[PDB]
Amino acid sequence: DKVPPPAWSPVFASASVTTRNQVAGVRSNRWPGAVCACAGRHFTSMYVGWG
Amino acid sequence: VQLEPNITLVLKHLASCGAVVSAEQQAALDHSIPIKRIEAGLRSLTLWGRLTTLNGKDYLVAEGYNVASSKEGAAVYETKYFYSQDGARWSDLQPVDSETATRCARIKGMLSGDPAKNYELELVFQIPELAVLRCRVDAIATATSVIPTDSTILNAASQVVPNRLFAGAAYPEKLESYQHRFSLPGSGVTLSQDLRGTWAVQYDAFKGVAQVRSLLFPGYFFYYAANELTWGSLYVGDGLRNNDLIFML
Amino acid sequence: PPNEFEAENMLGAAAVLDCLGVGLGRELGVNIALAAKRIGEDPKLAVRSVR
Amino acid sequence: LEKTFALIKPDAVRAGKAQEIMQLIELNGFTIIAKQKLQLTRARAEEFYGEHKGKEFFPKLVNFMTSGPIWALVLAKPGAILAWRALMGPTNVFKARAEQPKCLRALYGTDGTQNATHGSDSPISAAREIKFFFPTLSGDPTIYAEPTAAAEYITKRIQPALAKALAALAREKPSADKFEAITFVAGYLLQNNPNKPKVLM
Amino acid sequence: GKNKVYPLELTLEEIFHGCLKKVAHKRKVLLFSGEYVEEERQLTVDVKPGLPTGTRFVFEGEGNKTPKKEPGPVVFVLKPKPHPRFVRRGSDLVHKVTLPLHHALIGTTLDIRTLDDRDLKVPISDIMRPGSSLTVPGEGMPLPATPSARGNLVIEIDLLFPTHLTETQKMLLRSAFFLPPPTEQNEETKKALRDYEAAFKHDLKGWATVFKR
């Protein structure tokens, strides 16, 4: 494709958009294995994988 | 000993390597694997892997076969592949012809979510994304399908069937104890006959569990527990290939 | 449209129950959370509260 | 060691009691030689119930037997026919409940025609019916293998087509090798034969 | 040299699997009586898996018997009964499904129950053109020559366009059919799209998922 991909992609915790308490975060496309998560006031970052 | 790898045992043993799936998707899998196994005529439908994507809607890919014969010196399985975005409803992956199979290997990149996506090549060639997905799955399965040696056997009418008296592999840290699934049982072909630096084996000798990781395809993991004699394999991450193995090693 | 109802954080409840070691387990908990959403969302079965 | 035919009717299959019936059958000493779940069509059921041709109960009997899938079984035992008649009990469910309360008719039957099971009567009928539903199941090597019956069999059915085939071959006289002549005569037999037609497209 | 030709009607399942039919024949033998006398013969015809439509089965020596001439053969011509789903076209089936327009553009999965007792779910791989089609290899009738290979199921697509559209729906469609490429979008465009998506998929007051009344 002629469109360069973005560096961050969303990640969800449910296939339905009406679940009541679902976490939803982002994932790094440059460094694969780095994720960020947020639920209300509790957020996190973590990198698992090859460097 | 075992006749078909579990989904729960595989997802449990390969959790440390990042090979995990969402919990809601796990429950959906638990419910909707038998439904697809009965709708289609298959008798062994497991989870193959999970490919990432530019969206959050990763592709969960499952594989199932009815017959597994021995044709032209190779154990050939009439596999059928299915895909889904969530573990609820599965669709099918039709095979691709050779012209597309060669025009799909040049499309390097990360697949998008909608399986109705068309890539363009060069005149312009319009290729569907499901074709690319099937190409990548076929390539990974050709390069990586790993099972313990002697786990299969030949019967009358030349069908490869599970070795119900398999007593496990001695020295489960050596690559000589593992083989491609499409190697005939009598042949002494193993993973050692592949390129030397392609496969990495880490063996916990106390808990008796071995992990084989593909370095040519970095996201393919296989586990083999010797005490309970359970082996499984998953693939997480996209299906791109590590060309420059010589520099990394 | 889905009916507006008042439930608790059922996924958090399942997490707490699994932490303490009592209850039905996490996997059934995801199914209960989704079935309670099925019940509460029904416009015909207009519910003010599901538990 | 003999064997008999027995089918579980659609009424005991619609109620999900087939597996219990098989378990009871196996608990009493029987051995299920072959089983198959199948749905009869109208023509197949009418050919099946040939003996009660033009009877008063025939319409409802053939209409019930093709209302759902049934199970067909071959049961083997030294006294298989009489033992299966005894276990299967009296033929009328209302009479069965009074006479033998712990019998398959009493336990699963509901009506005079919905007796929930069907068994054979005599060894000739049993062999005929086993051949009807299991054409490839071997059996009875004594009545069939009999010099007088075997000569009659070859003369009546196989001989009329074979004599013409061996004549045509003697006329043609193909290569003296075995295989060419064998292939020629086999192709001739499979080409023009009395009972089967010729296929053209 | 007259022959009696009879249609023989089979269902697609029978031809797919290979039936074994028993047909009845009413044969007339001419005698000195003013009226004839007839008898019913039974004939076993064995149709092989996936025989082509129009196959002729000829029974030689069967047919009305005049006093002098040996009766000519009787012909059975194979024809298929109409099916609710499939129509065979040579060696492969054809399924004509009416498709919604948004299923064509966005893409969905068609559900088809094959002649064999297996269900089938086939994705829509691109924007289905009007009068276009889809092909699922190995899902047609068996080959009469080889009893293993089969044809390929052919889905013929006939779109079902919506009957009514409002002016705001047309505005949304025009905004969808002229959206700039993602590398040409302003920051205002991206913020507006994010806001609209968060509003259309609102879990309680959004219309992304509704229950039918």
Q: Which chains touch C (3 or more CB pairs under 8 A)?
A: A, B, E
Cβ burial, residue D125 (10 Å; 0-12/13-18/19+): middle
Q: Residue B76 and residue B160: Cα distance in Å, rounded?
A: 9
**Residue A2 CB-half CA count within 13 A:** 6
Encoding tokens for residue D135?
Answer: 């054409």
With CA atoms as reference, report the closest residue to D127 among D17, D33, D20.
D33
Range list of β-strands (E), chain A: 8-12, 24-28, 34-39, 42-47
Contact E153, E93 (CB under 8 A): yes
Which of E181, E182, E209 comes nearest A17 by C-beta?
E209
- Could you identify the residue written with the tokens 């044709």? B71
Q: Smallest Cβ distance to E201: which of A4, A17, A20?
A: A17
* Distance, CA of E43 to CA of D198 (rounded, Å): 13
Across the interface, whether the CB atoms of E55 and D195 are under 8 A apart is answered no
- Measured between alpha carbons, how far is B109 from A4 in angstroms, rounded to an integer? 10
Contacts of D189 (CB under 8 A, 6+ apart): D161, D162, D165
Contact D197 E59 (CB under 8 A): yes
Give C37's contacts in chain A (Cβ within 8 Å).
Answer: 18-20
Cβ-in-10-Å burial (0-12, 13-18, 19+) of D118 comes to middle
Chains that touch A (3 or more CB pairs under 8 A): B, C, E
- Interface A:E, Cβ pairs < 8 A: 15
Distance, in Å, from the CA atom of B113 to the CA atom of A12, rounded to the nearest integer, reads: 13
Q: Are B199 and B211 in contact (CB under 8 A)?
A: no
A18 interfacial to chain E (CB closer than 8 Å): yes
**CB within 8 Å: B24 and C27:** no
Within D51-92, where are the H helices?
A: 58-65, 80-88
Contact D138, D23 (CB under 8 A): no
Write the DSSP assignment of B24-62 as a string of letters: HHHHHHHHHHHHHHHHSS-S-EEEEEEE--SSS--EEEE
Q: Where are the alpha helices (DSSP H) in E98-209?
A: 101-105, 167-177, 187-200
Phi, then psi, of D126 in degrees rounded to 5 = -65, -50
D123, with CB counted inside 10 A (0-12, 13-18, 19+), is: middle
| Identity of the residue numbered B168 | G
Report helix angle D178-191 to D159-172, nearest 10.
130
Please give the Cα distance from D175 to D155 (Å, whole number): 29
Angstrom distance (rounded) from CA D81 to CA E57: 42
- Cα–Cα dist E168/D46, whole Å: 65
Question: Residue B161 to residues B152, B165, D167: CA-CA distances in angstroms?
Answer: 5, 12, 50
CA atoms of E94 and E97, how far apart (whole Å): 10
User: D148 to chain E, minimum CA–CA distance in Å?
Assistant: 28
What is the rounded distance in angstroms from the CA atom of residue D83 to the CA atom of residue D25? 11
Resolution of the solved structure (Å)? 3.2
Q: Which residues contact residue D182 at a Cβ distance below 8 angstroms, ignoring those fewer than 6 apart?
A: none
D171 touches E at CB < 8 Å:
no
Distances (CA, A) of D86 to D89, D108, D113, D116, D121: 5, 15, 18, 15, 12
CA–CA distance, D115 with D93 (Å, rounded to integer): 6
Q: Do B23 and C31 touch (CB under 8 A)?
A: no
Using a CB-CB distance cutoff of 8 angstroms, which residues of chain E are in contact with residue D192?
60
Interhelix angle C26-41/B23-39, nearest 10 degrees: 80
Q: What own/partner pairs with CB < 8 Å and gap ≥ 24 does B155-163 have? A: B158/B69, B158/B70, B159/B67, B159/B68, B159/B69, B159/B70, B160/B68, B160/B69, B160/B70, B160/B75, B160/B184, B160/B185, B161/B68, B162/B2, B162/B3
Subunit contact E57:D198, Cβ cutoff 8 A: yes
Task: Pick E55's closest partner by Cβ from D43, D196, D199.
Answer: D199
Residue of A9, A18, A21 to mutate for E, most E C-beta atoms under 10 A? A18
Determine whether the interchain pair B90/E121 forms a contact, defined as Cβ–Cβ distance below 8 Å. yes
Chain A residues within 8 angstroms (CB to CB) of chain C: 18-21
Q: Which of A46, A24, A43 is nearest to A34 (CA)?
A: A46
The CA distance from B226 to B207, in Å, is: 9
Beta bridge partners of D5: D74
Structural contact between residues B47 and B69, judged by C-beta atoms closer than 8 angstroms: no
Chain E positions with Cβ closer than 8 Å to A: 181-183, 201, 203-204, 206, 208-209
**E99 pairs with which residues across the strands?**
E159
CA atoms within 13 A on the CB side of D124: 0
Residue of E107, E120, E137 lying closest to B115 (CB–CB)? E107
Question: Is the Cβ of E204 closer than 8 Å to some Cβ of chain C?
Answer: yes
Q: Which helix (H) or strand (E) holds D118?
A: strand D117-119
Q: B158's torsion region: left (phi>0), alpha (psi -120 to 50) or beta?
A: left
Phi-psi region of B41 (alpha: psi -120 to 50; beta: other; left: phi over 0): alpha
Chains touching chain B through at least 3 C-beta pairs below 8 angstroms are A, C, E
Residue (of E74, E73, E76) closest to E55 by Cα position: E76
Up-side HSE of residue D36: CA atoms within 13 Å toward CB? 12
Q: Is B30's Cβ below 8 Å from some Cβ in C?
A: yes
Which of C33, C39, C34, C40 has the alpha carbon at shortest distance from C13? C33
Q: What token pair was written down for B36?
A: 């697809």
Q: Which residues contact E55 (CB under 8 A, 6 or more apart)?
A: D199, D200, D201, E47, E77, E78
Contact at 8 Å (CB) between A17 and E209? yes
Q: Is D118 a catalytic residue?
A: yes
Instruction: Check: CB of residue B128 under 8 Å from CB of residue B97.
Output: no
CB contact under 8 A, B120 and A1: yes
Handedness of CA B101, B106, B112, B117 (dihedral sign): negative
User: For residue C33, which of B60, A14, A39, E211 has the smallest C-alpha distance?
Assistant: A14
Contact C37 A21 (CB under 8 A): no
Give residues after which chain D gaps, C-N over 2.5 angstroms.
none
Which residues have a Cβ under 8 Å from the Cβ of B130 and sit 6 or more positions away? Answer: B83, B93, B94, B115, E123, E125
Q: How far apart are CA B182 and CA B180, in angstroms?
A: 5
Q: How far is A27 from chain B (nearest CA, A)?
A: 9
Q: Where are the alpha helices (DSSP H) in chain E?
A: 12-17, 101-105, 167-177, 187-200
At residue E213, what is the residue type? R
Q: On the CB side of B132, how many CA atoms lie within 13 Å of its CA? A: 28
Class of domain D2-133: alpha beta
Distances (CA, A) of D125 to B81, D3, D49, D121, D130: 50, 12, 12, 6, 9
Which of E117, E137, E121, E134 has its CA nearest to residue E16?
E117
C-alpha span between E135 and D80 (Å, rounded): 54
Contact of D102 with D89, CB cutoff 8 Å: no
Contact status, residue E148 vs residue E86, Cβ threshold 8 Å: no
What does the DSSP 8-state code read for residue B204?
E
* Catalytic pick among D35, D44, D118, D164: D118
